[PDB]
Chain A
Amino acid sequence: VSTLIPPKVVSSKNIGSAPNAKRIANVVHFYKSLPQGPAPAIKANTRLARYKAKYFDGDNASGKPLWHFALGIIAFGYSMEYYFH
C-alpha cells in the first residue's frame, strides 16, 4: 500500500542480538588491561628479598632450596644430634 521502511530500524535493534551481549562484555574487558607488561612489580623487597630473586622467584624452581635446607641440618651437627638427642 506504500513504501515499507525497515532499512533504518537498528537504533533499537542493536540490543537484543547475541553479538551485542558479547560486544558489551569484551569492550569492558579491554580498556583497563595493562598495555605492555606494565606494573609487573619485578622488584620484590620483603624480608629475605635476595631469596625472592634467586630461587623463590621460580625461574630455577629446582632442588637447591631443599639442598640449602639439608646443609642447614649438616651445619647443626653439634647442636641437635650432638650435645643433645
Chain B
Amino acid sequence: QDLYLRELKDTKLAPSTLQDAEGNVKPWNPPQKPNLPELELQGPEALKAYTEQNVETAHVAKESEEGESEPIEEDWLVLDDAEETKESH
C-alpha cells in the first residue's frame, strides 16, 4: 500500500542522490563528495604509514660477509690460544 510505497519513493529522493546517485546531497549543508572519495580515500593510508609500508619498500636484504677471509692472522693465533686453553684444559 501507498504509505510504504511513498516512503519507498522517499528512499528514491533523499538518499537516491546520497549513494544511489552522485548528486551530492540537498538537506546537508556540508558536501558529501570531498570527504570519503578524495580525503578519506587516502584515509586508510592516513591511518597507516605512507610511502614506506603501503609502497611496502621491497628492500634488498643487507649482505653480511664472512670473517673477512683472513685466516692466517687468527687461525694460528687461535691455534696458539688453543695451546693456552689445552694447558688449562
Of B7-15, B37-45, B78-86, the segment with at least 4 beta carbons within 8 Å of chain A is: B78-86
| Residue contact A9 to B86, C-beta cutoff 8 Å | yes
A4 within 8 A of B: yes
Q: Which residues from chain A sit less than 8 Å from chain B, CB to CB?
A: 1-2, 4-6, 9-10, 12-13, 16-17
| Residue contact B83 to A13, C-beta cutoff 8 Å | yes
**Minimum distance in angstroms from A9 CB to a CB of chain B:** 4
How far is A17 from B89 in the complex, measured between Cα atoms in Å? 12
How far is A12 from B83 in the complex, measured between Cα atoms in Å? 8
Q: List 23 A-B contacts (CB under 8 A).
A: A1-B67, A2-B67, A4-B78, A4-B82, A5-B78, A5-B79, A5-B82, A6-B81, A6-B82, A6-B85, A6-B86, A6-B89, A9-B79, A9-B82, A9-B83, A9-B86, A10-B86, A12-B83, A13-B83, A13-B86, A13-B87, A16-B87, A17-B87
